[PDB]
Amino acid sequence: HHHHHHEGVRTMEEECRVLSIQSHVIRGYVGNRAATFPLQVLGFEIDAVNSVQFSNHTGYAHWKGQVLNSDELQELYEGLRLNNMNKYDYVLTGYTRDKSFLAMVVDIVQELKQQNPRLVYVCDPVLGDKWDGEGSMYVPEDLLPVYKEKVVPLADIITPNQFEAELLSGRKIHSQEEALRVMDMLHSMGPDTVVITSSDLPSPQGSNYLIVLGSQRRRNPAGSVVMERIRMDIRKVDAVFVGTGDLFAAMLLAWTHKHPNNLKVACEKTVSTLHHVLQRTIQCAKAQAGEGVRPSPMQLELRMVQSKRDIEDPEIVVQATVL
Amino acid sequence: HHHHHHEGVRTMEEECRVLSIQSHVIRGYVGNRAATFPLQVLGFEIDAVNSVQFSNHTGYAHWKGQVLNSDELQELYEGLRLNNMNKYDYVLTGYTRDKSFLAMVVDIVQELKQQNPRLVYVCDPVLGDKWDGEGSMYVPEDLLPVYKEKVVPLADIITPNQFEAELLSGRKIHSQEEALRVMDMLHSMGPDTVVITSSDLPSPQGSNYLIVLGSQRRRNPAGSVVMERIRMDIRKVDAVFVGTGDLFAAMLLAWTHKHPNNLKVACEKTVSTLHHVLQRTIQCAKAQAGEGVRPSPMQLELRMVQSKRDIEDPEIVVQATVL
What's the Enzyme Commission number for this chain (chains A, B)? Predict the structure, then answer.
């Protein structure tokens, strides 16, 4: 009787409120631009709170705009508290330069979590990474002291990359047997799901064929804790991409929310989704500028719209191994 | 050759870019939050300058946020130019309440056109409505002289509710046919494509149906203003909806693009879309509140995400009538 299944259309499903306090640009896709469409095309009731609003990202030679301040995001957040619209399922965080905006973000994550003990604060540390081998931070020299004790302790999910992963532990990674150790070192700070978005640790398939690894505990079982882990390698989509960071944690949110406590398929639909993007991204970068040389930011921007088709459900292009 | 067609995974499908300058909200869907999503799902690359970042729409007892402004808008545009990327296709505007700001829109829409031979400014003359009998405006005096003498002259697709047309001309609408006389003064000055999305002209039929008067007037071979006239009945709705005009223009612009000089399925696909979306934002509103109780300021937030597919393929529940 497939006839009472259609009046289901009339039902109240779930509203998965996602407070995503990130940046917004006019042209291009970084931060919140990058985090919404996907999360929306995936049924999430996501709310965007601009941190900035630059004409474009800071990856081009120029940019102009404004930077929302702590005092502003404070008013911004109360307005909600007033008409009582301050209650989320997931608070999503990312790249942030100023320290006061970071403490404020916390407070909001903090109260939201005192207004809702159930909140899932998917947190992605704005620390920095490595370009010509050596590694540098990409923010003020005292953002870590904040990320260390008031952010990560509050977060339920983090997506460090090697350089940052290390910084949120105090040790350092030289092998595969340490990015799991340092991952053990981060839950003690709080995150119960830890992934190391990028690194340098080799793999049975080359340096080009880069890695991804992660761990997820839950001492929820009657007695003690249980802990599952995975890892995976992915050819290096050579081309240089910016926004990808922001999108990762988003899709690593959706798929996470949508599936059981198994980073495996969760992480597979996720790290895969980046592929059905980037491919269709690199491909066009060359579709126009002089049939004889490497592209530019604008000739390289994330072809995000076009990926709707794919976003709604990816064709797994990479497999993972269980541990 | 059913395999040389799947190839075309490389074919470049150009940027039907867009530059919507409307409002943004950290909850709810209105302005760019109701306008954005859909055009993005339709391969349109909407970019959202956000004239305002409020926590929520102005129907709530409270609402706080920060307003963009003259120079603050001017700079967003200045950046976009330093990367010599100002080249666009459309410009979608709406409820603006600052002449100083609007004149910035128009000044901006200028270099944008001297640049492109076939742009398409789609302006929504947000000025006012009608309570139970008479009319009236919710925008300061400053602005009416400007849309008259400034904006409309550059518009190309305007969507005046009946009043705004009357208020845009100072020419009350008598017989529906007079509406077709005002429209041509409107046509006369810019809009080669007026769409009186809303009006009061009694449909010969019923007494709860929106009359929408469309008019796309451009030419064939020689200098001959072929005109396309239209009307279609609209069962109305049961509540204080928001973002509809924004959702309406957002998509009038949409369809009017795959079917240029075929305004018929233009005001066609659009309309059934407010339909499906409204009857669903309300279909469930039926249960989201009390069993026999009225929807609140937030429960009545349009449901844009949960209408994803609807947006791609609007079953046209309303057939156009030429005149």
Answer: 2.7.1.35
What is the domain extent for residue A184? 1-323
Q: With contact defined as beta carbons under 8 Å apart, do A80 and A93 qualify?
A: no
Local structure of residue B77 (DSSP, 8 states) = H
What is the C-alpha to C-alpha distance for residues B256 and B284, in angstroms, rounded to an integer?
30
Taking the CA of residue B296 and the nearest CA in chain A, the distance in Å comes to 11
CA–CA gap between residue B112 and residue A65 (Å, rounded): 19
DSSP 8-state symbol, B72: H
Are B296 and B265 in contact by the 8 Å Cβ rule? The answer is: no
Q: Which residues contact B201 (CB under 8 A, 6 or more apart)?
A: B162, B173, B175, B176, B179, B211, B213
Experimental method: X-ray
**Which residue type, as a one-letter code, is found at position B17?**
R
Q: Which is it for strands B128-130 and B135-137: parallel, antiparallel or unpaired?
A: antiparallel
Q: Which residue has the tokens 């992660």?
A: A214
- Contact of B122 with B94, CB cutoff 8 Å: no
Mutate to test the interface with A, among B13, B73, B85 (most CBs of A within 10 A): B85
CATH number where A148 lies: 3.40.1190.20
DSSP string, A14-44: ----EEEEEEEESSS--HHHHHHHHHHTTT-
Picking from A286, A303, A304, A287, the residue whose alpha carbon sits closest to that of residue A295 is: A286
Q: How many domains does chain B have?
A: 1
**Beta-bridge partners for B240:** none
Provide the chain B residues 2-21 that lie in CB contact (below 8 A) with chain A: 9-10, 12-13, 19
Burial classification of residue A308, based on how many CB atoms lie within 10 Å of its CB (0-12 exposed, 13-18 middle, 19 or more buried): middle
CA A195/CA A253 separation, integer angstroms: 12
Q: Would you mind telling me the total number of residues written for chain A in this entry?
A: 323
